[PDB]
Amino acid sequence: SMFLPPPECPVFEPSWEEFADPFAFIHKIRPIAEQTGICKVRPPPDWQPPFACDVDKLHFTPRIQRLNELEAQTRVKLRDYTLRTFGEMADAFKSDYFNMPVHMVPTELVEKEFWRLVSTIEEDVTVEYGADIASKEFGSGFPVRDIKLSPEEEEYLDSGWNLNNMPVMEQSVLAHITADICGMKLPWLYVGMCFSSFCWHIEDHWSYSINYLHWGEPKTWYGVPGYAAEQLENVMKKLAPELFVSQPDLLHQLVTIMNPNTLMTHEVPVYRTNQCAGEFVITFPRAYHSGFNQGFNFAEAVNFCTVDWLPLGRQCVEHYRLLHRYCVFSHDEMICKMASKADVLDVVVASTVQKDMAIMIEDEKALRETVRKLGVIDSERMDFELLPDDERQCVKCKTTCFMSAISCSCKPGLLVCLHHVKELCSCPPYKYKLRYRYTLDDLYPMMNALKLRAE
């Protein structure tokens, strides 16, 4: 009555033939899983990456977490615990909370107890957790090249499901990006304890996310399919409007804990799963997800973008602009970078990039005609990729400029995208300059190179 568990998400058990290539597999399970938002992947029994670490030499600074529903939390972005001392803290917490041996507590009990304690205004439970990019003080759980590796570790060095390799595997379009997006293309490490949770969110630029539980007690997930993303946001906007005020920057995104039953009440489809050790969880583009840890564990997650994502990546940047939210990178700069590397691209990748570039060129053509009719006559080429991102964001909608922007001598250093020409300054239009990366005559050959590559 208190908590009705959402239905279970799809669970996939691929064979070795299927499991070999992750990108082919994901593209194969996409019709099913994009209807549920999240899905679980059980690797073949023989696939078992070795986990070896010294629990005494791995430290990390813990993050503190209050467990209150609808309360605002800042999203994690870019004394200490050793992994042993944290684990002793975590196990003692759960053991004392339930007065039971940590592993005799049912996962469904912890679930209903989590949703009890977060709604109860009386309870003041705070927990700690670890969340960070791999460093010298705390490295990846997967094998990496560096030290002498055992023959079994060498098996999994070049694996596709080694989340260190997934970003740069040449089917992830995030691989050829040279701009700094370290918080996006590098794996995150999550050290969890009982009730430690991650609030409702989607990935930056609506990218995929893949999560591997190396070891420990399960991680409980809740997922919402991408098509219901705005349904969920409406439900949340009503209950918690505090989360939807304009963010000063990217380090100030507000997220929250909210009961799935509340979403299911408003006809938002929600799915759940328990991710156990050695299992993958995959979230699809714009699929909202949240959850909590059943106890002491260690997870590793990374974002990635396939060819299927490219159109969504464009729609997302459009949506970011409507909301005046900062981008992590320029979508167009990425597209043009791949166009300039057409000869070395995968041919299916080149085909998809071409289609997106065709749309980009069509839009840019229309926008430049529009600003010309606004009086902007003067123009000059400008290498936007050389500018730090904070120096090339639209004054109005905060979008990162690459294809074009408008500048004015009256307001030096300031820029606006071509959607917000009126927002630059109070000077007449002939004082404006169109700053462009490419002429339309530069762009069509670039697209042609993609077409030839894709045959």
Ligand X SMILES: O=C(O)CNC(=O)C(=O)O
Binding site for Zn ion (CB under 5 A): 394, 396-397, 417, 419-420
x/- letters, 190..219, toward Mn ion (CB under 5 A): -------------------x----------
Q: How many other C-beta atoms can be found within 10 angstroms of the C-beta atom of residue 115? A: 19
Tell me the torsion sign for CA atoms 225, 229, 234, 236.
positive
Q: Specify the residue for token string 């467990």.
A: 67
Measure the CA–CA gap between 156 and 50, rounded to whole angstroms.
Answer: 8
Closest to Mn ion by CB, 209 vs 306, is: 209
- Phi, then psi, of 92 in degrees rounded to 5: -65, -35
Q: Closest residue (Cβ) to Mn ion? A: 209
Please state the closest distance from residue 45 (CB atom) to Mn ion, in A: 28
Closest to Zn ion by CB, 112 vs 419, is: 419
Size of the site for Mn ion (CB under 5 A): 1
Q: Which does 190 bind (CB under 5 to 8 A by kind): Mn ion, ligand X, Zn ion, none?
A: ligand X
Applying CB under 6 A, which residues contact ligand X? Answer: 190, 198, 209, 211, 283, 299, 301
Q: Which does 68 bind (CB under 5 to 8 A by kind): ligand X, Zn ion, Cl ion, none?
A: Cl ion
Please state the closest distance from residue 322 (CB atom) to Mn ion, in A: 7
Measure the CA–CA gap between 47 and 67, rounded to whole angstroms.
Answer: 36
Helix, strand, or coil (residue 10): coil
Near Cl ion by CB under 5 A: residue from 8, 56, 108, 123: 123
Residue 203 annotated as lining a ligand binding site: yes
Residue 129 annotated as lining a ligand binding site: yes
Tell me the torsion sign for CA atoms 288, 60, 304, 76.
positive
Instruction: At 127, list the tokens.
Output: 């927990």
DSSP codes joined into one string, 70-138: T--EEPP----EEHHHHHHHHHHHHHHHHTS-TTSS-HHHHHHHHHHHTT-SS---EEEEEEEE--SSS
Closest to ligand X by CB, 159 vs 275, is: 275
Measure the CA–CA gap between 376 and 439, rounded to whole angstroms.
Answer: 16
Please state the closest distance from residue 300 (CB atom) to ligand X, in A: 9
Closest to ligand X by CB, 190 vs 320, is: 190
Closest to Cl ion by CB, 123 vs 249, is: 123
Is residue 68 a contact point for Cl ion (CB under 5 A)? yes
Q: Closest residue (Cβ) to Zn ion? A: 394
Q: Which does 417 bind (CB under 5 to 8 A by kind): Zn ion, ligand X, Mn ion, none?
A: Zn ion
Which residues lie closer than 8 Å to 179 by C-beta, 6 or more apart? Answer: 329, 330, 333, 334, 385, 389
Please state the closest distance from residue 71 (CB atom) to Cl ion, in A: 8
Helix crossing, 331-339 with 310-323: angle to 10°? Answer: 150
Which residues lie closer than 8 Å to 204 by C-beta, 6 or more apart? Answer: 184, 303, 328
- Phi, then psi, of 6 in degrees rounded to 5: -60, 160
Closest to Cl ion by CB, 68 vs 399, is: 68
Closest to ligand X by CB, 214 vs 392, is: 214
Q: Which does 394 bind (CB under 5 to 8 A by kind): ligand X, Zn ion, Mn ion, none?
A: Zn ion
Helix crossing, 347-372 with 310-323: angle to 10°? Answer: 30
Measure the CA–CA gap between 158 and 47, rounded to whole angstroms.
Answer: 13
Q: Which does 403 bind (CB under 5 to 8 A by kind): Mn ion, ligand X, Cl ion, none?
A: none
Q: Which residues are near Cl ion by CB under 5 A? A: 68, 123
Residues annotated within the binding site for Fe cation are 201, 203, 289
Binding site for Mn ion (CB under 5 A): 209
Q: Which residues are annotated as a binding site?
A: 129, 201, 203, 209, 211, 219, 289
